[PDB]
Amino acid sequence: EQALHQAWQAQLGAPPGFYAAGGDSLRAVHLLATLRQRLSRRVPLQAFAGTPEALLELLRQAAPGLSLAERRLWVAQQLAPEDTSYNLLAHLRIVGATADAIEQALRQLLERHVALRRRVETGVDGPQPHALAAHAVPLQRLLASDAVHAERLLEDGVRREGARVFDLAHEAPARLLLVVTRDSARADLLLSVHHYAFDDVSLAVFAAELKTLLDGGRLGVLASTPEQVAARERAALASGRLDRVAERWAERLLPLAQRLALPVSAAVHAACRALAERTSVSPFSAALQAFAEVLGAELGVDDLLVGVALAGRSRLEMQGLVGCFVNLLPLAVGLRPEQSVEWRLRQVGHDLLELLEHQDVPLECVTQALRQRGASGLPIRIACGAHAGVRVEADFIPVPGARLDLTLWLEDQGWLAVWTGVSAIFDLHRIERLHQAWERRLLANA
Ligand SMILES: *P(=O)(O)OCC(C)(C)[C@@H](O)C(=O)NCCC(=O)NCCS
């Protein structure tokens, strides 16, 4: 106690149900990771996120190479060396810093985040990273004569970096373009980086730290590295702890074994939140339920496999890292008309917290567990996810094409619904129809 208090306040910006108080499932994980790092006690997420009082009771009850996330992107690239759909492009808009300051801050960030400056060799028991010097990361600086010229230079960069095949064995997996505009405080940075070396949270980390440096602040020493994360995972794999979770999930899973960005209507947003609070699940849980219900009806099945995209940063020391930590784990959604909306939702919510709790279990363990019970693999086709001083704005430019047949990503800008389909299966018009069905389903469910 007085530590539950501290962690709760740090997360929600106000003292002490967690969801009722403004919380979500991800903040809940972070709360518990903070408590675990302090007090050396693991409260399971299901138990908690399934009040300050409930958490206090749970606390008292509680006892005192490349990673697979990196490797699955690296391997995918090796199987299709000319495929550039693992190239991430981030455009950072910076107002109030000089070109020299930006460049110096970028060199510091490159030195600090080794993922941005390694080469990878093939290796007998898996790929092997080797660090390069920060100076080995290309950084081109251009002066634009005006704001429109700067736009043209950026668009040129986008096209060039989008088409670039990274030589991951000999060069850093990152490239920087800095465009400064004559007689303006605005600078533009295009970070081009291979996906094996970066992810969504990494951009937020990179941009926040860039701003700190440009404001004249200092960065703390990092509590970990990608290689250490990988080593911990090698140990957890050897120990069998990850495989035992996967084997349990395999049981329930065995039977089953073009971009459009639309604002979510205010009424659908409210419906979703109401439904969530009534059932003590996350708003995302409600959104996911409706997605599964709609896709289930469309495809004409009683049970649907839905991938859930997870940040995969299970420990406090992983929160400030740059690298690829993302994981995708399967959820089975039964479409059972006999059960209440509320009960189906509570089940979805609980299965979600289960995946989140165990987001350190790599997809490959689940796949393996399924093979050991006779299935060929795990055919996930559909997925769901959610995303003073110098001004720094950072945004990914979406990757074209699609590995999964269809995904829905919810962005907490109201909400924005981003649907991405394989054109040959889910073209624009079909996605639009699915989006409308999804909105109607949420309203109905509420
Ligand atoms: P909760 O049920 O409110 O939220 C669900 C979630 C924890 C899975 C989600 O909020 C989350 O963890 N998002 C992180 C995903 C990310 O940053 N990267 C995925 C890109 S592939």
Author numbering: 740 to 755, 760 to 793, 797 to 810, 823 to 1015, 1034 to 1163, 1173 to 1198, 1201 to 1233
Copied sentences from the primary study:
Non-ribosomal peptide synthetases (NRPS) are multi-modular/domain enzymes that catalyze the synthesis of bioactive peptides. A crucial step in the process is peptide elongation accomplished by the condensation (C) domain with the aid of a peptidyl carrier or thiolation (T) domain. Here, we examined condensation reaction carried out by NRPS AmbB involved in biosynthesis of l-2-amino-4-methoxy-trans-3-butenoic acid (AMB) in P. aeruginosa. We determined crystal structures of the truncated T–C bidomain of AmbB in three forms, the apo enzyme with disordered T domain, the holo form with serine linked phosphopantetheine (Ppant) and a holo form with substrate (l-alanine) loaded onto Ppant.
The Ppant transferase, Sfp enzyme, was used to convert the apo form of AmbB T–C into its holo state. Each of the two holo crystal structures have four T-C didomains in their asymmetric units. The Ppant arm is covalently tethered to the invariant Ser768 in the conserved GGXS motif, situated at the start of helix α2 of the T domain. The orientation of the T domain, places Ser768 at the donor entry side of the C domain of AmbB, with the Ppant arm extending into the donor pocket towards the active site. Among the four protomers in the structures of holo AmbB T-C tethered with Ppant, only protomer D shows well defined electron density for Ppant but the ligand is in an unproductive configuration, where the thiol moiety does not point towards the putative catalytic His953. Ppant resides in the donor pocket that leads to the catalytic groove of the C domain. At the entrance of the pocket, one of the two phosphate oxygen atoms of Ppant is hydrogen bonded to Ser1058 from the C domain. Leu769 and Phe1060 form a hydrophobic pocket around the gem dimethyl moiety of Ppant. The walls of the pocket lining the Ppant are constituted of Ala1085, Leu1086, Ala1087, Ala 1162 and Tryp 1194. The terminal thiol end of the Ppant is surrounded by Val1102, two negatively charged residues namely Asp957 and the highly conserved Asp958, as well as the catalytic His953.
